Scaffold this active site. Sequence first.
Site, PDB file in Angstrom:
ATOM      1  N   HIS A  79       0.816  -1.239   0.000  1.00 36.34           N
ATOM      2  CA  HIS A  79       0.000   0.000   0.000  1.00 36.34           C
ATOM      3  C   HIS A  79       0.841   1.277   0.000  1.00 36.34           C
ATOM      4  CE1 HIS A  79      -3.061  -3.046   1.255  1.00 36.34           C
ATOM      5  NE2 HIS A  79      -3.701  -2.431   0.245  1.00 36.34           N
ATOM      6  N   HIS A  83       1.745   1.892  -5.428  1.00 38.99           N
ATOM      7  CA  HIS A  83       0.345   1.459  -5.617  1.00 38.99           C
ATOM      8  C   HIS A  83      -0.490   2.693  -5.974  1.00 38.99           C
ATOM      9  CE1 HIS A  83      -3.590  -0.511  -4.903  1.00 38.99           C
ATOM     10  NE2 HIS A  83      -3.833   0.286  -3.836  1.00 38.99           N
TER      11      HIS A  83
HETATM   12 ZN   LIG Z   1      -5.662   0.551  -2.811  1.00 47.91          ZN
END
Ligand SMILES: [Zn+2]
Length: 324
Positions: A79, A83
Amino acid sequence: HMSICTSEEWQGLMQFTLPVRLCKEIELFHFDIGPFENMWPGIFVYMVHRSCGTSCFELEKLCRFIMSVKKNYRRVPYHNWKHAVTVAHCMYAILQNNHTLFTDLERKGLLIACLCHDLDHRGFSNSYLQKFDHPLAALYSTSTMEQHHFSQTVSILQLEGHNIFSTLSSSEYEQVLEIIRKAIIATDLALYFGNRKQLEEMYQTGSLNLNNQSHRDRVIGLMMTACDLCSVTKLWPVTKLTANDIYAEFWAEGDEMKKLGIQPIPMMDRDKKDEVPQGQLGFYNAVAIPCYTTLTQILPPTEPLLKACRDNLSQWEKVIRGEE
Ligand SMILES: [Zn+2]
Ligand SMILES: Cc1cc(C)n2nc(CCNc3ccc4ccccc4n3)nc2n1
Ligand SMILES: [Mg+2]
């Protein structure tokens, strides 16, 4: 409590130009940003300028926003900033291949929202923050992380010199923020199932209507999910690699559970690694395929997403049957 970029960071950004060769590749749905870290912020400015035009935002305020957003992504395995831009890129491709379906205001809001959608992720699931018993789950009790992410986005907007939306009317300003909010809350996968089901129905009965704002919101939501997961629409090598990153995060959260004599579900249990191909198959079949299938129905130009997801799926079948 927000983090700002330095003059260096943002000015360097303003000077960046995109190598001629990437221009074509960026337009493709399967494009992988992986090989190009330096460029990621530049790649986003580029996508912005191509979506909404070169004077849609004051270049100075835009570059400052981008670089402060970067600084508020943590160094977790999945994350992260990477991303952030991948999801952003997939929404660009979707916006570009459906250009007249959305308003200037939605295209600005959605690109920004994608960039910001996982801001300040700690690598912990919503389940983990609530189910044991973090200060943010005491603050928001559904969609914890996603309300946080939106609130971070707003805090970055509210910083000195960052408000890229400042030149909108207050009606337009208060409209895009609302587009952005719904967009980021829609990335909570728990909401996706109900949402995809509604849409499926509405399409089936032929009662789906993009002039109806509540329908619109639903479609955007689906788009958000489809961008959120687009790792599964890359080419096999990339997809395989990214799976490692998402599992690295899971397993770390599983490790933290184990540290309080609590057995994690198998998804989060690094001692359960060999169940991973199976689990991926499951996920494609229960979550991804249906996502891209319905997205394609509503927005036919997005078919290549569904097409690549199908290819990764068959790659995972092959890992299972002993042939990769
Ligand atoms: Zn996401
Ligand atoms: C790119 C991407 C983005 C997201 C949100 N997910 N979520 C998943 C769930 C995996 N499901 C499972 C489910 C059960 C499992 C059991 C054992 C091992 C792995 C397992 N794995 N895979 C993703 N890949
Ligand atoms: Mg999220």
